[PDB]
Design a protein around this motif. Sequence first.
Motif, PDB file in Angstrom:
ATOM      1  N   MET A   1       1.120  -1.500  -0.214  1.00 33.42           N
ATOM      2  CA  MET A   1      -0.178  -0.313  -0.038  1.00 33.42           C
ATOM      3  C   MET A   1       1.048   1.268   0.038  1.00 33.42           C
ATOM      4  O   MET A   1       0.576   2.102   0.111  1.00 33.42           O
ATOM      5  CB  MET A   1      -1.129   0.667   1.301  1.00 33.42           C
ATOM      6  N   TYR A   2       2.222   1.384   0.497  1.00 33.94           N
ATOM      7  CA  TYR A   2       2.854   2.005   0.587  1.00 33.94           C
ATOM      8  C   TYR A   2       3.399   2.296  -1.112  1.00 33.94           C
ATOM      9  O   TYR A   2       3.732   3.748  -1.701  1.00 33.94           O
ATOM     10  CB  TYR A   2       4.370   1.836   1.491  1.00 33.94           C
ATOM     11  N   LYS A   3       3.980   1.133  -2.182  1.00 38.36           N
ATOM     12  CA  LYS A   3       4.142   1.331  -3.243  1.00 38.36           C
ATOM     13  C   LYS A   3       2.741   2.206  -3.653  1.00 38.36           C
ATOM     14  O   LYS A   3       3.487   2.918  -4.812  1.00 38.36           O
ATOM     15  CB  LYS A   3       4.884   1.107  -3.739  1.00 38.36           C
ATOM     16  N   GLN A   4       1.773   2.124  -3.800  1.00 33.56           N
ATOM     17  CA  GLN A   4       0.992   2.350  -4.076  1.00 33.56           C
ATOM     18  C   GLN A   4       0.693   4.402  -3.907  1.00 33.56           C
ATOM     19  O   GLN A   4       0.996   4.761  -5.154  1.00 33.56           O
ATOM     20  CB  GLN A   4      -0.659   2.072  -3.432  1.00 33.56           C
ATOM     21  N   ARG A   5       1.199   4.853  -2.656  1.00 29.67           N
ATOM     22  CA  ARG A   5       1.455   5.742  -3.040  1.00 29.67           C
ATOM     23  C   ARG A   5       2.772   6.943  -3.144  1.00 29.67           C
ATOM     24  O   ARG A   5       2.197   8.157  -3.925  1.00 29.67           O
ATOM     25  CB  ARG A   5       0.915   6.435  -0.833  1.00 29.67           C
ATOM     26  N   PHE A   6       3.322   5.813  -3.356  1.00 35.31           N
ATOM     27  CA  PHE A   6       4.235   6.504  -3.854  1.00 35.31           C
ATOM     28  C   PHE A   6       4.262   6.588  -5.173  1.00 35.31           C
ATOM     29  O   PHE A   6       4.322   8.065  -6.337  1.00 35.31           O
ATOM     30  CB  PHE A   6       5.340   5.601  -3.810  1.00 35.31           C
ATOM     31  N   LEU A   7       3.646   5.770  -5.621  1.00 35.34           N
ATOM     32  CA  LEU A   7       3.293   6.129  -7.733  1.00 35.34           C
ATOM     33  C   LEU A   7       2.075   7.179  -8.130  1.00 35.34           C
ATOM     34  O   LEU A   7       2.111   7.612  -8.678  1.00 35.34           O
ATOM     35  CB  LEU A   7       2.969   4.505  -8.057  1.00 35.34           C
ATOM     36  N   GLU A   8       1.094   7.258  -7.507  1.00 36.55           N
ATOM     37  CA  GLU A   8       0.547   8.453  -7.308  1.00 36.55           C
ATOM     38  C   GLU A   8       0.580   9.301  -7.175  1.00 36.55           C
ATOM     39  O   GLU A   8       0.651  10.228  -7.709  1.00 36.55           O
ATOM     40  CB  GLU A   8      -0.576   8.343  -5.750  1.00 36.55           C
ATOM     41  N   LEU A   9       1.646   9.890  -5.534  1.00 38.05           N
ATOM     42  CA  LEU A   9       2.480  11.397  -5.642  1.00 38.05           C
ATOM     43  C   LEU A   9       3.358  11.464  -6.778  1.00 38.05           C
ATOM     44  O   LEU A   9       3.304  12.301  -7.424  1.00 38.05           O
ATOM     45  CB  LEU A   9       3.045  11.139  -4.240  1.00 38.05           C
ATOM     46  N   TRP A  10       3.897  10.437  -7.593  1.00 39.16           N
ATOM     47  CA  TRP A  10       4.708  10.268  -8.329  1.00 39.16           C
ATOM     48  C   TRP A  10       4.064  10.959  -9.848  1.00 39.16           C
ATOM     49  O   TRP A  10       4.338  11.490 -10.539  1.00 39.16           O
ATOM     50  CB  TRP A  10       5.638   8.980  -8.954  1.00 39.16           C
ATOM     51  N   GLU A  11       2.826   9.863 -10.138  1.00 40.22           N
ATOM     52  CA  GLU A  11       2.430  10.279 -11.589  1.00 40.22           C
ATOM     53  C   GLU A  11       1.386  12.241 -11.299  1.00 40.22           C
ATOM     54  O   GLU A  11       2.038  12.820 -11.594  1.00 40.22           O
ATOM     55  CB  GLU A  11       0.662   9.499 -11.728  1.00 40.22           C
ATOM     56  N   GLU A  12       0.999  12.593  -9.986  1.00 38.33           N
ATOM     57  CA  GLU A  12       0.992  14.016  -9.544  1.00 38.33           C
ATOM     58  C   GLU A  12       2.186  14.975  -9.884  1.00 38.33           C
ATOM     59  O   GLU A  12       2.028  15.542 -10.847  1.00 38.33           O
ATOM     60  CB  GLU A  12       0.213  14.725  -8.315  1.00 38.33           C
ATOM     61  N   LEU A  13       3.161  14.282  -9.420  1.00 34.69           N
ATOM     62  CA  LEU A  13       4.631  15.202  -9.302  1.00 34.69           C
ATOM     63  C   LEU A  13       5.108  15.700 -11.183  1.00 34.69           C
ATOM     64  O   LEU A  13       5.550  16.405 -11.967  1.00 34.69           O
ATOM     65  CB  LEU A  13       5.534  14.624  -9.237  1.00 34.69           C
ATOM     66  N   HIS A  14       4.515  14.246 -12.301  1.00 34.33           N
ATOM     67  CA  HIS A  14       4.904  14.816 -13.521  1.00 34.33           C
ATOM     68  C   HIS A  14       3.294  15.019 -14.394  1.00 34.33           C
ATOM     69  O   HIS A  14       3.397  14.548 -15.678  1.00 34.33           O
ATOM     70  CB  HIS A  14       4.678  13.126 -13.889  1.00 34.33           C
ATOM     71  N   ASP A  15       2.334  14.919 -14.027  1.00 32.69           N
ATOM     72  CA  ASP A  15       1.212  15.373 -14.339  1.00 32.69           C
ATOM     73  C   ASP A  15       2.117  17.083 -14.754  1.00 32.69           C
ATOM     74  O   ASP A  15       1.620  17.298 -14.122  1.00 32.69           O
ATOM     75  CB  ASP A  15       0.230  15.730 -13.569  1.00 32.69           C
ATOM     76  N   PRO A  16       1.589  17.167 -16.272  1.00 32.31           N
ATOM     77  CA  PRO A  16       1.902  19.060 -16.763  1.00 32.31           C
ATOM     78  C   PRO A  16       0.751  19.583 -16.281  1.00 32.31           C
ATOM     79  O   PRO A  16       1.128  20.922 -16.470  1.00 32.31           O
ATOM     80  CB  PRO A  16       1.483  18.473 -18.278  1.00 32.31           C
ATOM     81  N   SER A  17      -0.933  18.813 -15.900  1.00 36.34           N
ATOM     82  CA  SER A  17      -0.998  20.670 -15.531  1.00 36.34           C
ATOM     83  C   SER A  17      -1.189  20.671 -13.950  1.00 36.34           C
ATOM     84  O   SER A  17      -1.207  21.948 -13.589  1.00 36.34           O
ATOM     85  CB  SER A  17      -3.198  19.651 -15.552  1.00 36.34           C
ATOM     86  N   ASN A  18      -0.356  19.660 -13.145  1.00 38.43           N
ATOM     87  CA  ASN A  18      -0.266  20.673 -11.782  1.00 38.43           C
ATOM     88  C   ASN A  18       0.455  21.678 -11.841  1.00 38.43           C
ATOM     89  O   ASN A  18       1.303  22.040 -10.430  1.00 38.43           O
ATOM     90  CB  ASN A  18      -0.508  19.372 -11.072  1.00 38.43           C
ATOM     91  N   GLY A  19       1.669  21.723 -12.796  1.00 41.09           N
ATOM     92  CA  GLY A  19       2.791  22.861 -12.628  1.00 41.09           C
ATOM     93  C   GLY A  19       3.564  22.329 -11.759  1.00 41.09           C
ATOM     94  O   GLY A  19       4.760  23.623 -11.881  1.00 41.09           O
ATOM     95  N   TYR A  20       4.540  21.398 -11.920  1.00 40.30           N
ATOM     96  CA  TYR A  20       5.367  21.142 -11.246  1.00 40.30           C
ATOM     97  C   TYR A  20       6.952  21.199 -12.266  1.00 40.30           C
ATOM     98  O   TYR A  20       7.474  21.105 -11.871  1.00 40.30           O
ATOM     99  CB  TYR A  20       5.311  19.744 -10.446  1.00 40.30           C
ATOM    100  N   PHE A  21       6.391  20.555 -13.317  1.00 41.38           N
ATOM    101  CA  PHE A  21       7.725  20.760 -14.312  1.00 41.38           C
ATOM    102  C   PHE A  21       7.088  21.910 -15.525  1.00 41.38           C
ATOM    103  O   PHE A  21       5.840  22.384 -15.781  1.00 41.38           O
ATOM    104  CB  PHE A  21       7.634  19.999 -14.752  1.00 41.38           C
ATOM    105  N   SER A  22       8.038  22.399 -15.985  1.00 41.05           N
ATOM    106  CA  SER A  22       8.781  23.411 -16.922  1.00 41.05           C
ATOM    107  C   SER A  22       8.447  22.502 -18.545  1.00 41.05           C
ATOM    108  O   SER A  22       7.655  21.189 -18.417  1.00 41.05           O
ATOM    109  CB  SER A  22       9.496  24.061 -17.009  1.00 41.05           C
ATOM    110  N   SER A  23       8.237  23.180 -19.275  1.00 37.55           N
ATOM    111  CA  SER A  23       8.749  22.962 -20.904  1.00 37.55           C
ATOM    112  C   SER A  23       9.377  21.845 -21.148  1.00 37.55           C
ATOM    113  O   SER A  23       9.764  20.986 -21.777  1.00 37.55           O
ATOM    114  CB  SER A  23       8.164  23.717 -22.006  1.00 37.55           C
ATOM    115  N   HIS A  24      10.974  22.627 -20.486  1.00 39.11           N
ATOM    116  CA  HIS A  24      11.757  21.465 -20.869  1.00 39.11           C
ATOM    117  C   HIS A  24      12.284  20.432 -20.457  1.00 39.11           C
ATOM    118  O   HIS A  24      12.976  19.781 -20.645  1.00 39.11           O
ATOM    119  CB  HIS A  24      13.241  22.059 -20.506  1.00 39.11           C
ATOM    120  N   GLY A  25      11.264  20.098 -19.395  1.00 40.08           N
ATOM    121  CA  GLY A  25      11.661  19.108 -17.834  1.00 40.08           C
ATOM    122  C   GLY A  25      12.060  19.358 -16.628  1.00 40.08           C
ATOM    123  O   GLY A  25      12.558  18.195 -16.332  1.00 40.08           O
TER     124      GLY A  25
END
Length: 618
Positions: A1-25
């Motif tokens: 259940m811990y790896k599920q949390r890691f992967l969901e926060l990973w998806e949220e970090l790599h989601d372009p809509s959340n604004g965590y990353f720029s155009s270059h990556g």
Amino acid sequence: MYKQRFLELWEELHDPSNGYFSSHGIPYHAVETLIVEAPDYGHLTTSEAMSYYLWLEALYGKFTGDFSYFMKAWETIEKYMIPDSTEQPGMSSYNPNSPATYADEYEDPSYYPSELKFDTVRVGSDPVHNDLVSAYGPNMYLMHWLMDVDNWYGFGTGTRATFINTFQRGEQESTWETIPHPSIEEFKYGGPNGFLDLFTKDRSYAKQWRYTNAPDAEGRAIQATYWANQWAKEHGVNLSQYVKKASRMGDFLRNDMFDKYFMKIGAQDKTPATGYDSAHYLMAWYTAWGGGIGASWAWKIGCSHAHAGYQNPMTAWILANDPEFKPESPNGANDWAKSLERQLEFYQWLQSAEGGIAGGATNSWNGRYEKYPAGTSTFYGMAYVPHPVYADPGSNQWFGFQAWSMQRVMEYYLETGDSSVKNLIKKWVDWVMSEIKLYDDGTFAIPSDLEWSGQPDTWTGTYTGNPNLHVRVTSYGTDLGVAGSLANALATYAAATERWEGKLDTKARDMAAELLDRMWNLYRDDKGLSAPETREDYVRFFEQEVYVPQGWSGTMPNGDRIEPGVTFLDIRSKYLNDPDYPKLQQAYNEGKAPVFNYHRFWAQCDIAIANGLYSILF
């Protein structure tokens, strides 16, 4: 259940809509643009963010076997964070006999700019540059800590990213008193002579390029590369090129192991040192290297100050006792072998009566190589300072440094069953268990402010208990990044005691699980995890005079007049377009403190990394 949390926060970090990353990556410091920490703008990037990026896709590669994101993170670091060979001209003109010129440190920003000494003070010698050049070349494989991803300050051309420098004017210069300037100076903006005349006082000013590193970031990058290599070898992926990249990064990291001007450690004076007589074998605060634009010269400096939160025993162990990571220079392994032992003894020395690791040591007293006051304790001749480098908010007032440094110490304990540092680790764990205040509800409060008193005993190879060194917790908060770091340290304790002691210590593991579960349950968010912050210091947002020196006039690229009497907001006038500015102004006017919900890249990286490291070996 811990790896599920890691992967969901990973998806949220790599989601372009959340604004965590720029155009270059490139990752941002935080999604919210209005946030004033060590980075004064939300959408800047830090080398610690890229080190957490490396650790995050190292964990992603462990969990899925996909190191392509990790490889791309390394390529982005080499392309964007590590200055390019074309961005490093005149580095071949470096003279290892004369690395740099002398300059003082002053207790107040009003003293700046600082007069530069050319011949009154003799600088020592650098015994590692020749080996580094013979192995790789003139260019240094180190990151620059701060970068403007989207050219918000406008120092570059178009949208292209720009290296920037903020912290230049001593101890009492907080974030609110920094003047951001570009690292690659082209004389375009600022006043006459670029921004150089603000900090360093010279008779003649020329086009320059500067790069400062944060050895915390390089140490985390090397540790992430080591763990990625181990997990890849478990999978079967070949990462030899990137392991070699981290190996040369670690070889260049040995510039941090030296005094700022390569002077004898413990000399209590500005006495020049010969080779290896200036190495204190400790991760200092920074190293800075630079050169001229259109001219042929270069320079390097280390740092005298050592902070306990910057030491990384794991990186020293990896770079000393791993054949795969062995530096090309023959002397790298021996230097890292010495550094590991020195760092461990430093950690042992600094611990207090309760267990709190005090602030580090320094080779220069007040930044001017003055004699220590009577009664001052020494560590291999290095005096004890409670708050090194920065004193405006307190360098060791923040509790996150305890977790950050003890996580490295406990990871080293897990990998190398070293019996030398067991009592330190137990005392620190007991102290942090004492000072954590849980509640019958789902909420919690961990220390945020620390008050230190006294001095440790002078080091003689053994720990006396330090009867005179004391610490007390003054403020209890709900910081989530520090909670992630602390849970990571406690889980590392549990695993290390399971592997290299009689039995698993269930208290630390249970406390880490409770912290993670309570934090995730209470403070789940659309963009990750966050909790409200009172943020009193934001009053300075409207009232902090940034101290432009009198008689110096410059223009920010957007047109702001940088003059004496300017406050924080005046030279950052593009903040008035920020969506959160009206709320800040309303809260400032009506009196109460402004409450914020902040989503930092490094805080969410800590939460996810701690979750994964709790999943690992369990």
